[PDB]
Each structure stands twice: as C-alpha cells, then as structure tokens.
C-alpha cells in the first residue's frame, strides 16, 4: 500500500535537493521501483544530464542489476524503447528476452518490422495469428510459408495488409517464393490489388507466373485476373 509511499519518497529526495538518495532508493529497491510503470517512465524520460549518472546509462544499469521483468514491466520496457529512438534497444530486448518475447513485443515490432517481430514469434511464442499479421517485407520465407503452407493465408490478407501501407515494394515480395506452386489467396485479386495500387503489378503476375510454372498449379481464374489486369495495364 505504499506504493504510492515509495513514489512520495522519490519525488520527495528528487523534489528535496538529493537526487543520489532518491536514485539510491529507487534503483536499489525491490519489486522494480524504477520499472513500476510510472517509474520506468520517469527515468526513461530525463535525458542525459551532467552532475550525476546518466538516465539512459543509470537505467541500462538498473535493468541489468534487476534483470527482465514481467509482462506489464516487460511491455512499459517495450512501449516506449521502440519509439524512442532505441527501437534496436527494443529489438534487443525481444531478442536477448530482456522483454517478455510475448506477443506485443513482437507486434510492436511488426509495426516497425514485421520480419523480426515474425522471427520471435516463430522462436518465443510460436504464434500464428501476431507472426504473420504483420508480414510488410523481410525475410520472405515466413511469410511465403505462412500464405503458402494453409495455413495461413490471412498471413496473405496480412502482408497485402502490410503491403498497402508498404515502404518496400516491386521486387522482394512473397507470392513467388510461396506461391511457385499456385494457390488461390483469400482473395488473389488483393494480391494484384495491392501490386497494382503500388504498380507492383510486375511481381504480382511475375510471381503468380512462377506458381503457373508449377504447372498443375494453374488456375485459370489466377490467369484470368494476371491477364485482365494486362488488358488494362500492358497487354
């Protein structure tokens, strides 16, 4: 219950003159008292600062004495590390499972990199549904297989997601390498949809040749839609 007594006696020492005993205090104290969220927030909030130990490097510090923390003292770690410049941070984190290799470690990341985020995914949690959910680019295998091996081809409608707010583009996607063996997507229309809306169109029929190229993988409906969108772009 003094929760907030613990927080009174750190504003109190900041507050009083004596940021070495507030820091002393809160660094040094149990049940994370510098990553109980408002805490963590504090100290992940004062930049560097001459006269004392750097915040960066005090909490750096303070997280290596204490060690990972749970889901919640994992994910405040997350939430702000990926935004605040230290996205590697956050990436070592998920990585080195300073944070909890959970699913919205992962998730932030595909925000910002689906491949890795989709790398823990595949090695922490072994999920589906956050994994391939955000498939933008990257390391094409996961994605491939994931639209290529039902399931799942929501991992498709989740890189075409992906793909319609893409910053990569033409070039390293997905269907060919999943797709040399034609399939039918959750819709194929999607895929050309996005490659077309990002001009793209070249790898959508590029690759959907190559799953032709397999060749009782052939759909006349795949071709159906690679020509008509030939008739209206480039016979």
Known sequence: GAEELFARKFNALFAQGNYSEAAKVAANAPKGILRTPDTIRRFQSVPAQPGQTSPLL??????????????????????????????????????????????????????????????????????????????????????????????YTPDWIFLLRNVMRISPDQGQQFAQMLVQDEEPLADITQIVDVFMEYNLIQQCTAFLLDALKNNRPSEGPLQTRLLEMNLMHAP
């Open 58 to 151: 005090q909490y750096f510090g303070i997280l290596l004495d204490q060690g990972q923390l749970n889901k919640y003292e994992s994910l405040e770690l997350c939430r702000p590390v990926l935004q605040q410049g230290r996205k590697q941070l956050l990436e070592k984190w998920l990585k080195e499972d300073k944070l909890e290799c959970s699913e919205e470690l992962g998730d932030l990341v595909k925000s910002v990199d689906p491949t890795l985020a989709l790398s823990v995914y595949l090695r922490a949690n072994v999920p589906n549904k956050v994994i391939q959910c955000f498939a933008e680019t990257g390391q094409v295998q996961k994605i491939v297989l994931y639209a290529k091996k039902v399931g």
